[PDB]
Amino acid sequence: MLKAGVHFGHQTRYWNPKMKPFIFGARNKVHIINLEKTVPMFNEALAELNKIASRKGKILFVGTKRAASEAVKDAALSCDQFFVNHRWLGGMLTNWKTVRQSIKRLKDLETQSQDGTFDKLTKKEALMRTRELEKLENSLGGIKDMGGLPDALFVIDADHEHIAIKEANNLGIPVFAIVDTNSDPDGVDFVIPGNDDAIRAVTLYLGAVAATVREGRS
Amino acid sequence: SLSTEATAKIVSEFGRDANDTGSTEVQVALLTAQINHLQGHFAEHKKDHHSRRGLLRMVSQRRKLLDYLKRKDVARYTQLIERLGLRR
Amino acid sequence: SMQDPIADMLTRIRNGQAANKAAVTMPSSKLKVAIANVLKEEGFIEDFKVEGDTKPELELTLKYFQGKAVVESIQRVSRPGLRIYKRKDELPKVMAGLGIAVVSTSKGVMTDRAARQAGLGGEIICYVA
RNA sequence: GGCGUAAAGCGCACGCAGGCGGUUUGUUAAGUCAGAUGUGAAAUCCCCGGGCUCAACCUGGGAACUGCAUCUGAUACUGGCAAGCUUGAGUCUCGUAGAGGGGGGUAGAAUUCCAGGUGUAGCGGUGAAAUGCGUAGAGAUCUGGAGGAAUACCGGUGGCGAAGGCGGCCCCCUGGACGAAGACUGACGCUCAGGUGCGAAAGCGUGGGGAGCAAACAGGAUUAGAUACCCUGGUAGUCCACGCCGUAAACGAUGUCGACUUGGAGGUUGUGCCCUUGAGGCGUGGCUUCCGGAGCUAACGCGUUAAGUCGACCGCCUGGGGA
């Protein structure tokens, strides 16, 4: 992407030792990921994501931290990709036989809020007895229409959204992630170079990920 | 614990062209000079198994370096053990 | 301490291949560069290079093609304390003929093929697939 | 096949005789590999022709029995022998820390003992109590003094030592390890039966020693009983001159030796470099603690200080109850 920018100085320190093949360290008081093991792969990574989108693969976007959620939802709300932008539910892709009933409970509690003791003229406190609904919608609201299993995961940070990576590696699904020296090199299928001081400037990369999952003419 | 000033009376006589101090003929002399010094040392005193094992270490290395010199040249071996006390 | 230059030769390769490394390096010797020359000829390695004014060290490059390791067995067989010697029809068929063996012989390091073609036997040095 | 525990790794140091050992050349041919001629008795397996249907059996022809000897090639590796090396191993210039050892010392406190004062019925002790100490003036508080042992604090995230173990300050004697910048030898290495030398507590010997703690013992009890717990007294033993003893949950229950290889946090000791113009910053050897990853393991753990990856040598071992 050629931008990238200037920083002085970070990561002295702060590394996952499973990165030794990909890192330069133990010298010059730096720990830094080798530009020859990020950029020559990142210029040739989105072709492999268009390869999933072009066969109607179901795409998932994840970013639940407030400085990233603002851009992640803006890149999925009127797109083919599905999203999670506030919070994860336990086993939301792995425990599928239960999550499919949790998606059904979005109807059950919505219709409960219109029945019997809840079909009243006053609801002020009464609808706090059905607040399980918005607690479940907080996780399912952008993915309730996806069904079964996805075909690709994109995640805005390889470490701050780790539950989505744990679900995806159990379910066998390719993970595309933005990396950091403290993240894990084993949970990710395609790495993207970037810095957390640039989490509002990488909107162009998310732009290219979103453009890649709509190129075609398939 | 043997000074550069005490070695100056060993490497002078057991040498030949200088520096020779790495050679078996000079190291067997430098071990003998430490063995014979750490022999007494003892009497007065006895009850120190650490320096006793140090003495037996220096003897262990000398026994081997003598056997090794004899296994390279018998004449250079016999012409050393007339200048250092061995076999009475 | 160290008795056999071959007892730390193939471990590096078996463990480096498990670490997914593209090159493996060792202290050089006559037999190490004789084995490497045949492993290159039979295509088990890509290339090898040797250099050092203080201590000569030998680096060889591993084959993975597009990701999967190309050498599917790396074994020694025979050791100086208990050597294995095979005769002109007792020469082995490694991995039931999917792999090969290397022998030292009176004519110098060669394959079990080259030995059986030469109508001779000798001492085992390596087993590969 | 197996040695962390389930069952076996020696408590430890050094090392002869054994096993094992880098590398450049030649040469020997013990050993290997290749080729022959002899031999490997006959029955007999297995192939296969007869004889009784099948076959046991009688056989007619083959094969194998990798062997062994005697002749003869290959000339690579191992042993051997010489010649040649080093970047395996070693010692060192200037230097570094340490409760290591030995010999010397050297200092303080209370229960105690010794001679008394001041002084009155208390003291001591347990979950409860009681023997017992005390009116001979206790307990406690003072004056002047004797006796024996150990070394408060800092002390830990720490060191050292072969282990066992070892903290004071001060003066000698001394092993080993370790850093900086170089050099002289030239495989001189790794291991090790039986040896050759070590000891914590307790015990044995000869002579001293005796505050505190205390087996044994005598009481108080307590109790159904108490021979014990718990309380009051108390010798052996603890200390020293030494001389013996040689054993341990001697324990991170992991034999010694070498290489290769994710870390983090932290301690401890040298040291390369930037006017250290240096508090700072950038490095780098030695030793080592906790957390833990690939691998290993039945499991817990081991985890670059590996129970991992692989090699040399040694020591052991095949169920309890009996023993």
UniProtKB/Swiss-Prot annotation, chain A:
InterPro entries linked to this entry: Ribosomal_uS2, Ribosomal_uS2_bac/mit/plastid, Ribosomal_uS2_CS, Ribosomal_uS2_flav_dom_sf
PROSITE patterns: RIBOSOMAL_S2_1 (PS00962), RIBOSOMAL_S2_2 (PS00963)
GO cellular component, one term: cytosolic small ribosomal subunit
Domain of life: Bacteria
UniProt GO BP: cytoplasmic translation; ribosomal small subunit assembly
Subunit note: Part of the 30S ribosomal subunit, contacts bS1. Some nascent polypeptide chains are able to cross-link to this protein in situ. In collided ribosomes contacts ribosome rescue factor SmrB.
Annotated function: Required for ribosomal protein bS1 (rpsA) to bind to the 30S subunit.
Protein name per Swiss-Prot or TrEMBL: Small ribosomal subunit protein uS2
UniProt source species: Escherichia coli (strain K12)
Lineage: Bacteria, Pseudomonadati, Pseudomonadota, Gammaproteobacteria, Enterobacterales
UniProtKB/Swiss-Prot annotation, chain B:
Assigned keywords, A-Z: Ribonucleoprotein, Ribosomal protein, RNA-binding, rRNA-binding, Translation regulation
Domain of life: Bacteria
Any one GO cellular component localisation term in the record: cytosol
Name of the coding gene: rpsO
Organism from which the protein derives: Escherichia coli (strain K12)
Cross-referenced HAMAP family: Ribosomal_uS15_B
Induction: Part of the metY operon that extends to pnp, also has its own promoter.
Pfam families given in the database record: Ribosomal_S15
Purpose: One of the primary rRNA binding proteins, it binds directly to 16S rRNA where it helps nucleate assembly of the platform of the 30S subunit by binding and bridging several RNA helices of the 16S rRNA. Binds to its own mRNA, stabilizing it 5-UTR and preventing its translation. In the E.coli 70S ribosome it has been modeled to contact the 23S rRNA of the 50S subunit forming part of bridge B4. In the two 3.5 A resolved ribosome structures there are minor differences between side-chain conformations.
GO biological process: cytoplasmic translation; regulation of translation; ribosomal small subunit assembly; translation
Quaternary structure (record): Part of the 30S ribosomal subunit. Forms a bridge to the 50S subunit in the 70S ribosome, contacting the 23S rRNA.
Record-linked InterPro entries: Ribosomal_uS15, Ribosomal_uS15_bac-type, uS15_NS1_RNA-bd_sf
Descriptive protein name: Small ribosomal subunit protein uS15
SMART domains cross-referenced by the UniProt entry: Ribosomal_S15 (SM01387)
Disulfide cysteine pairs (residue numbers): none
Keyword Ribonucleoprotein: yes
Homology family: Belongs to the universal ribosomal protein uS15 family.
GO molecular function, one term: rRNA binding
Swiss-Prot record, chain C:
Key words of the record: Repressor, Ribonucleoprotein, Ribosomal protein, RNA-binding, rRNA-binding, Translation regulation
A cellular component annotation (GO) from this entry: cytosolic small ribosomal subunit
Keyword Transmembrane helix: no
Repressor among keywords: yes
Example GO BP: regulation of translation
GO molecular function, one term: rRNA binding
Signal peptide: none
Family: Belongs to the universal ribosomal protein uS8 family.
Assembly, per entry: Part of the 30S ribosomal subunit. Contacts proteins S5 and S12.
Stated role: One of the primary rRNA binding proteins, it binds directly to 16S rRNA central domain where it helps coordinate assembly of the platform of the 30S subunit.
PANTHER family: 40S RIBOSOMAL PROTEIN S15A
UniProt name for this protein: Small ribosomal subunit protein uS8
Source species taxonomy: Bacteria, Pseudomonadati, Pseudomonadota, Gammaproteobacteria, Enterobacterales
Name of the coding gene: rpsH
